[PDB]
Write a structure and sequence with these properties.
155 residues, alpha/beta, 4 helices, 5 strands, Ribonuclease HI, RNase_H, nucleic acid binding, magnesium ion binding, magnesium
């Protein structure tokens, strides 16, 4: 409903696993809000997911969202993976929980509350806002404050 929320996201992690951070910009109404935070031990995939999640959760009103992100990971999950996962109860073929299910479920939840349009960005030139989320992410990764609880060498 809500006029037209514009969301930008990016995540960055210094090792696999390693320190990581996310950067998200929300242009909700004439305003702009910035979200950023760093984790001591996580992965790039997790930070790319977290980014979309934090931004979407900030919205308490059913909105018309335009989310811009360059993650192939988020792209594959939204365009191909998720409906097939739900159907299989979120398990791969060998009956194990899909990797990062904790995060995919959290994203799926927020996904249902809005009219989302996904803009798959190629890569930074011409996209200043994603360049900035990347700076924010890189920066948070340099000063991790939180722990990535759902992270697991296991699954």
């Amino acid at each position: 409903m809500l006029k037209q929320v514009e969301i930008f996201t990016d995540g960055s992690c210094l090792g696999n696993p390693g320190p990581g951070g996310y950067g998200a910009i929300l242009r909700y109404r004439g305003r702009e809000k910035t979200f950023s935070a760093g984790y001591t031990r996580t992965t790039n995939n997790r930070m790319e997911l977290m980014a979309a999640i934090v931004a979407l959760e900030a919205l308490k009103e059913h909105c018309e969202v335009i989310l811009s992100t360059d993650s192939q990971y988020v792209r594959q999950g939204i365009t191909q993976w998720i409906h097939n996962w739900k159907k299989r109860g979120w398990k791969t073929a060998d009956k194990k929980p899909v990797k990062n299910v904790d995060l995919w479920q959290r994203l799926d939840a927020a996904l249902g509350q809005h009219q989302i349009k996904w803009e798959w960005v190629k890569g930074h030139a011409g996209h200043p806002e994603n360049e900035r989320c990347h700076e924010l992410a890189r920066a948070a990764a340099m000063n991790p404050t939180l722990e990535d609880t759902g992270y697991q060498v296991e699954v």
